[PDB]
Amino acid sequence: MKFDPQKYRELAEKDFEAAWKAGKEILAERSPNELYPRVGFSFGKEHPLFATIQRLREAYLSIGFSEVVNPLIVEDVHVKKQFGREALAVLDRCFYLATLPKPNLKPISSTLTLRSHMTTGWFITLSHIADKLPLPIKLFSIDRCFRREQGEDATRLYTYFSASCVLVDEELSVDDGKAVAEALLRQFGFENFRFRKDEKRSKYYIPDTQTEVFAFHPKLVGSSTKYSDGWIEIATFGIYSPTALAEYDIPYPVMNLGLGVERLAMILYGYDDVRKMVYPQIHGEIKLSDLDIAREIKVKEVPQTAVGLKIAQSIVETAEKHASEPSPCSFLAFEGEMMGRNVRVYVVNENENTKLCGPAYANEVVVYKGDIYGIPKTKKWRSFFEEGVPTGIRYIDGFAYYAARKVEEAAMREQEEVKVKARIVENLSDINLYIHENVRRYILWKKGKIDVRGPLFVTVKAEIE
Amino acid sequence: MKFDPQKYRELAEKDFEAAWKAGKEILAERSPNELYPRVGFSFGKEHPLFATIQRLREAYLSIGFSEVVNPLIVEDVHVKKQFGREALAVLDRCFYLATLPKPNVGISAEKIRQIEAITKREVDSKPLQEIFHRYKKGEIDGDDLSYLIAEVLDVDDITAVKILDEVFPEFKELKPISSTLTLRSHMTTGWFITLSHIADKLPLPIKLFSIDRCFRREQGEDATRLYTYFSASCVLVDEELSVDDGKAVAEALLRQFGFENFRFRKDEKRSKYYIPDTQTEVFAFHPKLVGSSTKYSDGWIEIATFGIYSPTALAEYDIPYPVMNLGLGVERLAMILYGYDDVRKMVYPQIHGEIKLSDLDIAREIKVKEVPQTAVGLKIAQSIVETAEKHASEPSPCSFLAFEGEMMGRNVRVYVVNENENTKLCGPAYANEVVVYKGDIYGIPKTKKWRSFFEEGVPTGIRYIDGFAYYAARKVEEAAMREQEEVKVKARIVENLSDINLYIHENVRRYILWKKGKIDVRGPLFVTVKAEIE
Amino acid sequence: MKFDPQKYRELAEKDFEAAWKAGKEILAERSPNELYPRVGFSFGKEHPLFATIQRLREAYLSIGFSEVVNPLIVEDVHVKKQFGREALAVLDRCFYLATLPKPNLKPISSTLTLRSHMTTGWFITLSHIADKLPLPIKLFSIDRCFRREQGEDATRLYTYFSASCVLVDEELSVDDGKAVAEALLRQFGFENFRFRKDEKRSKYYIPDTQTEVFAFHPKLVGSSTKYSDGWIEIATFGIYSPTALAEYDIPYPVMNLGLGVERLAMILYGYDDVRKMVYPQIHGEIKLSDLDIAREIKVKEVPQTAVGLKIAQSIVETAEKHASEPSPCSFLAFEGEMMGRNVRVYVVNENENTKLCGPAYANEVVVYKGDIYGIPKTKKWRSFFEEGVPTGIRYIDGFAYYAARKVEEAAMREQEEVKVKARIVENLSDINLYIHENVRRYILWKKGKIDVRGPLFVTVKAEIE
RNA sequence: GCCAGGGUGGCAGAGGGGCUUUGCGGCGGACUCUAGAUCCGCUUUACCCCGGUUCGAAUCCGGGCCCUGGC
């Protein structure tokens, strides 16, 4: 709360520490659902695909390549202009754009196609600058592409992200393509590189230039896959055929390196199933931390009055000690008045031989590995208490508030007495605690479980007159 | 050059100032194309579009929303689930994914295929009527190097590219076949699918965003729209929602891009997927816009849209809770930020010939053709400058010793002369520099008339004589190989760079023209350099 | 609110649009302090100094230079090792580190000094790698420095940020220093560059290499300063003297370019007074947008019941039309019951000749250029309404809630009748509206003003029995 | 979407059934010239797409696009 500079200012002149301890007065008093971890900040979280993409843009920029956006929708006449006589073989794997005919039904395919890879648009973009700008030209672009490869879902998908770049100079070896791969690929951890000529020998790449980069990343050695040796084919590249360049008037050669993003994204953040990565919202993959599950566990009914708080706060204060005395046996915990009439609180196990409070009065709720447990803090549960997030809410704590608010209902209902009792704990409601219906459908979905059981055996009678 | 730390230290410890002025020995004597701005560093540059997309990402993340990738290609059945009836109206402005079928090598084109000379072009190889069926079964692109380079011999595709052209005129009959798959017009289409799988399993409120591509059809015109665009979108899932939440987000979002005031109007469309009377149009005022060659002189521009998803479409995906959806269109926001007027010219600039080199970049490309090769020549020219730079007003004729030394092991002595008379040793435009300005290369002299060019353009630092000197510096060294005895190189008038030793790579040359630039390098340089290489 | 998929699902099968409009039912109903712009998200905002710093790191990295952290605290013996015989002249402008002597009072100066510029630490850092790593070496570092230059505050400060870098090769011209300046400086807008030899001729720079970069930035032409010509000295650089390198065993030369950050930061974000930039929290410079001032303007007392809302909501609904009828004249607006007893609301200007509602019943509150106004939406105030942020809260609106909640106090106080009246409006309290005491001390600090005046002249009587 | 004038080569811009401008610029060659001029040689015989009329159309008729004096 807002204090007074002077007041405290002067107050410190006399006995300092007496005024220092006086400071504790400004601290706010917190209710049960107002303290950590039932209250916490949040924050956005980026997707591994995109992250990697940005991480790739910089990587490219860092080795000199300027960014550019290439044509995405194109007339197949281009694929044809490039692949020469192999052009049709390719047009198969590509998609075509079809539209609906205006009924002044049945889509009418057209000559347009979604690019199967960046290269389709490259020749188009390089066509306008290849002979006007000073060499070398270093362009790159990380955008979307569309392939039809078997039209699968498991192995691959309909749209991927190419991390393309092109180098336009008067003289180019396959080497420039080698350098660019290492410079680019190294900024991600890859340490050793190996290149092997590609058999596919795509016709748009000068014969015997098309290569396949193989990079080693220590993050892989030991991986639960065939990438355990540490190496993985991570990118391909070649040098555009004069046959294709000619088709677009590009006089100088051109080196073109392509990077398969979803793969890199996977290597980096360690996902195994591309789909489970790029599309986890669908593939059931969704998680909440124990700390999160925790925060979501909150007291249902809680004392709505200043006194109410100091009531249950006492109820427990006694059970924390008198939960032993051989029952029957009654103890008094509170003495004061709320709203208008004086009040006193009673605690006793009316029943015959046994103890006052059940053996579960001291069971704390903790979340662990996805499950919500109700357990005593015994040298047996340690790991659950030292690897999970202990709610901080104990059985008696959970209980108290219920009573401290239940007598609060009688205090305003004119009533004179109420006997709030509690035996077993079949779940949370029984311990006066809840979780939004959604975290619930969650726990189940993530096939986790809630084990909040226990013999509380504690009753509280209160009289207001 | 590297020096000796000890020496330079034990000498400086005693005598400092002497060591200091000595340092100059470690610097490097650069030739002519080894000087600024003939030398420089290069750096990559980002594209306004991708740039904004990044800013946009951070922006969102900075307000709670977590990133997600939504379904791009979807069954139009979804659209018809998000518009009920008004669906068709949309699917007209959408694209469907067509695709080439396989060469029907059976039935229709089989019977009449078995009534001619099946095969004449000698190829033999047992009837691979199954290796062709595995095609009408499941093949792809990287499968040609199997039924040729491993079938009818012949490497990779040296005969496969034509064997499928001459003997197989069939393939040239395939036609893409439309389907029910579509390229989402806007993000929303994919939100229902994604929110579908989690609208009730994760804790509320749900804040998700995604800046990805979307395809639309609108009068095939590069100007009045583009086939593909970007849509920085977000969805807010929570129990209780009001259009306010749409504003609150639109505010906090735009506010990180300058915009200082917002106004929201109700959209006329009144689309079906949005609750009735919630589809809002958000207008924001941004300073950079105040007074411009645009229609947003007053500063206000409509930058996004948003509304609540009808509890109707939500059910179509079994989503219990209501959901807010804001949709900032990137391309514009980018133009406003990076100052562009024409969408197409901005996003796709190389294509629209919007390339451009700077004064400084042109100046950097103007190299010196004929340049020395021996430490001597470097001095010969360096010297030819001295005598020619000083004795510029000497009523010709008249020789002038410029250099005296041994080059390549031969006594060398070159002089700066003039043949005619009634004039001066060197022409008037001998001390003319090449200044690039406003995109045109110039060969002018410093004046109170040219100031504008030397203080706005960027001087190359090369003057006609400085250019020539290097040409001569080469000739003399040449004779030092042809062991001649007398070379008298001479240059009259200047009409271009050639007549100055200067030049520029062909590409920069074409740029100049393409850009309507102009090179102006003329003037009386007149100054011969007679050499006496013994 | 959470709806039912099926219910709405089927409901749409019959008449769609009847079910569509049925959708409006899920939308939450908002109270006065719950709608825009009295509710809005917030977000961090970086400081121009730092921003520019990061923006500088990338710039450097983008031209190849790797990052490194140099020594900050150093024995003056270094300044001495470098400046040779000029070393003392320098030691003047530098600070020294002094500590308190442990009393088993008066600080005891020491031999340590806070670096006056990066160069002091450069020689130290280059000492270990200059001859072990492959050339060229390109290092950079943007860190803090300490100068004593006149020990001023106005002109300059005690600590600045140097954006240093060093280039270690076998052969180096002054040119490398020129290139690096343009490459670095261009990534910020600077278009044309001019270098002039520095007279200072610092002794640690090979004689006649020390230069001063002058860069042109169109963002300056027309500036309200001497940087109107567009050019500004933005950085200096030279080539380390063999005399100094020798002192640290560096065999090869070294080019060193230094960038004065606070200046660049200023050019970029356009601040004139460095201090008003780097330290605005102190120099009174603190702002809130009209939109912000707006959001902070909220209804004080508002209907705490479901009905209460639909009450004031009606009170206004009538004044919005009957604020004309020649007074006296009474109208009824509400008919229903709250909590338990039926209720009716009256509105009349008991007084003699005039109109029912004062001429200010339709005055909306809007914030503009820093002031909080209470004005009618007349074709005279337009600009205030089209450049500012209209609260949306009008006089009657502000009023209503007061009444609708005032009768709510009688409804629970057992009472039978209440006459809430209102004549003039001397300020906000009078219109039932407030602003946190802090935005208030703000408006004043930013010497802005609040003009919420007006003759509301509107009374409301209500009877509950 | 609606009356009407128009959509000509690197640029400007007359005419216009088929042969057909012109000026600027560039391209190549030549010049006794101390200054930014001189002469000779030059393209892709240029006039959007699909139909109609004709011996034939850039020049004549309809449909699709592009700039407007206007709604």
From Swiss-Prot, chains A, C:
Catalytic function, reaction form: tRNA(Cys) + O-phospho-L-serine + ATP = O-phospho-L-seryl-tRNA(Cys) + AMP + diphosphate
Protein name: O-phosphoserine--tRNA(Cys) ligase
Transmembrane segments: none
Gene3D superfamilies tied to this protein: 6.20.250.20, Bira Bifunctional Protein, Domain 2
UniProt keyword Nucleotide-binding, yes or no: yes
Job of this protein: Catalyzes the attachment of O-phosphoserine (Sep) to tRNA(Cys).
PROSITE patterns: AA_TRNA_LIGASE_II
GO biological process, one term: translation
InterPro entries membership: aa-tRNA-synth_II, aa-tRNA-synth_II/BPL/LPL, O-Pseryl-tRNA(Cys)_ligase, Phenylalanyl-tRNA_Synthase, SepRS_C
Alphabetically ordered keywords of this record: Aminoacyl-tRNA synthetase, ATP-binding, Ligase, Nucleotide-binding, Protein biosynthesis
Record note on quaternary structure: Homotetramer. Interacts with SepCysS.
GO molecular function: ATP binding; identical protein binding; phosphoserine-tRNA(Cys) ligase activity; tRNA binding
EC number: 6.1.1.27
Family per record: Belongs to the class-II aminoacyl-tRNA synthetase family. O-phosphoseryl-tRNA(Cys) synthetase subfamily.
